[PDB]
C-alpha cells in the first residue's frame, strides 16, 4: 500500500533490535545431530525454555563460532522439522508447505505441541535474522496474519502462538503474505554482483584487490543467473538474497584464504556464509574447481 516493502523491513529490523537489547543469562542446550528434532523438541520445550527470545548456545555432538554452531543447528532443525516426512507439513502441486491435516491421525494428540514448537523455531529464525529455504503456501501464511481451510485450525493456532513467543504478531501484520515469504527465504530477484562485492568480507589475507579475489570476481561475473543462485546457496544455504541486500546478511558473505594446496576444492561453511577458497591464480583453475565444488554439493 502507501509505504513500500523496503522501508517496512527496516522498521521490522529496528523493532527486533530494541527488543533484542531489552532482554540482555542465555540458554545452553546439548543436541545430538543424529537426533536433532527429538532433542530440540525436548530441550527447547516451552516447559524447559519459556522465553525463546533469549540467546541460545548449542553443543552439537555429531554423535564454527558458537553463533555459527547455533545457525547450523537451527537450519538443520528447521529442515528436519518441516520435512513432509515428520508428518506436520505437506506440499501442494508446487512444493508449497502447509500443515498436514492427518497430523493427529498420524501423530496422536500431542500434535499441537509440535506445531507450537515449529512456530517457535521459525520465529527464532526470523528473530536471529537468518534466511531459510522454507517455501510456504500463501494461504498458510495469511492464516498466520489474521471452506476447507478450517481442518488445520488447531494446527495454525498453535503454530501462530509459537511464532508470537519470539516475534510479535503485530510486527508481522505490517506485511503481505508474499512479503512474509520474502522475510523467510529471501527476495525473488537476480543476484547483484555489485551489491555482493560491495558487502563482501575478506579474511585470511584476501582483500578486494588480492589477485585471487580479482580472478574470483572475473569468474563469477561470467556466471549465469542460475550459477549465481547456486553459488549463493552453496555458501549461505539460501539461494536468495536478503530484501535489503547483502549489507543486511548476517554474517556478511565472506571469502577466506584456503591453502596454497591446489588439490583442495573450495569448501563452504553455510552457518557463517563463508567460502574457503584456495589461492587460485588462474581463471580456468578457479572456475572449474568452484563449479565442481558447487555441483558436488547438490
Q: How far is CA 28 from the centre of its chain?
A: 21
Resolution in A: 2.7
Q: What angle do CA 84, 85, 90 make, to 5 degrees?
A: 20
Question: Are 231 and 294 spatial neighbours (Cβ–Cβ below 8 Å)?
Answer: yes
Assigned superfamily of 189-298 = Hect, E3 ligase catalytic domain (3.30.2410.10)
| Closest C-alpha among 224, 202, 204, 227 to residue 214 | 202
The alpha carbon dihedral of 46, 48, 54, 55 has a sign of: negative
Q: Which residues are catalytic?
A: 271
Question: Are 127 and 87 spatial neighbours (Cβ–Cβ below 8 Å)?
Answer: no
Work out the number of other CB atoms within 10 angstroms of the CB of residue 32. Answer: 15
Backbone angles phi, psi at 92, to 5 degrees: -75, -165
The C-alpha atoms of residue 265 and residue 293 are separated, in whole angstroms, by: 6
| Closest C-alpha among 100, 80, 81 to residue 90 | 100
Question: Are 134 and 185 spatial neighbours (Cβ–Cβ below 8 Å)?
Answer: yes
295: left (phi over 0), alpha (psi -120 to 50) or beta: alpha
Domain ranges (residues) in the chain: 1-146+152-188, 189-298
3-state secondary structure string across 55-83: CEEEEECCCCCCHHHHHHHHHHHHHHHCC
Q: What is the chain's Cα-based Rg?
A: 20
Here the cell at position 200 is: 563482501
Amino acid at each position: 500500500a502507501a509505504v513500500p516493502f523496503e522501508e517496512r523491513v527496516k522498521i521490522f529490523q529496528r523493532l527486533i533490535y530494541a527488543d533484542k537489547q531489552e532482554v540482555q543469562d542465555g540458554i545452553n542446550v546439548t543436541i545430538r545431530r543424529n537426533y536433532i528434532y527429538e532433542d530440540a523438541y525436548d530441550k527447547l520445550s516451552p516447559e524447559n525454555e519459556p522465553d525463546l527470545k533469549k540467546r541460545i548456545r548449542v553443543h552439537l555432538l555429531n554423535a564454527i563460532d558458537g553463533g555459527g554452531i547455533f545457525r547450523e543447528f537451527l537450519n538443520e532443525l528447521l529442515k528436519s522439522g518441516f520435512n513432509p516426512n515428520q508428518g506436520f507439513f505437506k506440499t501442494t502441486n508446487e512444493g508449497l508447505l502447509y500443515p498436514n491435516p492427518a497430523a493427529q491421525m498420524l501423530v496422536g494428540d500431542s500434535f499441537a505441541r509440535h506445531y507450537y514448537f515449529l512456530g517457535r523455531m521459525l520465529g527464532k529464525a526470523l528473530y536471529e535474522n537468518m534466511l531459510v529455504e522454507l517455501p510456504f503456501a500463501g494461504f498458510f501464511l495469511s492464516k498466520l496474519l489474521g471452506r476447507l481451510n478450517r481442518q488445520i485450525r488447531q494446527h495454525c493456532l498453535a503454530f501462530r502462538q509459537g511464532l508470537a513467543n519470539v516475534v510479535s504478531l503485530e510486527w508481522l501484520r505490517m506485511f503481505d503474505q508474499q512479503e512474509i515469504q520474502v522475510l523467510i527465504s529471501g527476495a525473488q530477484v537476480p543476484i547483484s554482483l555489485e551489491d555482493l562485492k560491495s558487502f563482501t568480507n575478506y579474511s585470511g589475507g584476501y582483500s578486494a584487490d588480492h589477485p585471487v579475489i580479482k580472478v574470483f570476481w572475473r569468474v563469477v561475473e561470467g556466471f549465469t543467473d542460475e550459477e549465481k543462485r547456486k553459488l549463493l546457496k552453496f555458501v549461505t544455504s539460501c539461494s536468495r538474497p536478503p530484501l535489503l541486500g547483502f549489507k543486511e546478511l548476517y554474517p556478511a558473505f565472506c571469502i577466506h584464504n584456503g591453502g596454497s594446496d591446489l588439490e583442495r576444492l573450495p569448501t563452504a561453511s553455510t552457518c557463517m556464509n563463508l567460502l574457503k577458497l584456495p589461492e587460485f591464480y588462474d581463471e580456468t583453475l578457479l572456475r572449474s574447481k568452484l563449479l565442481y565444488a558447487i555441483e558436488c554439493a547438490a
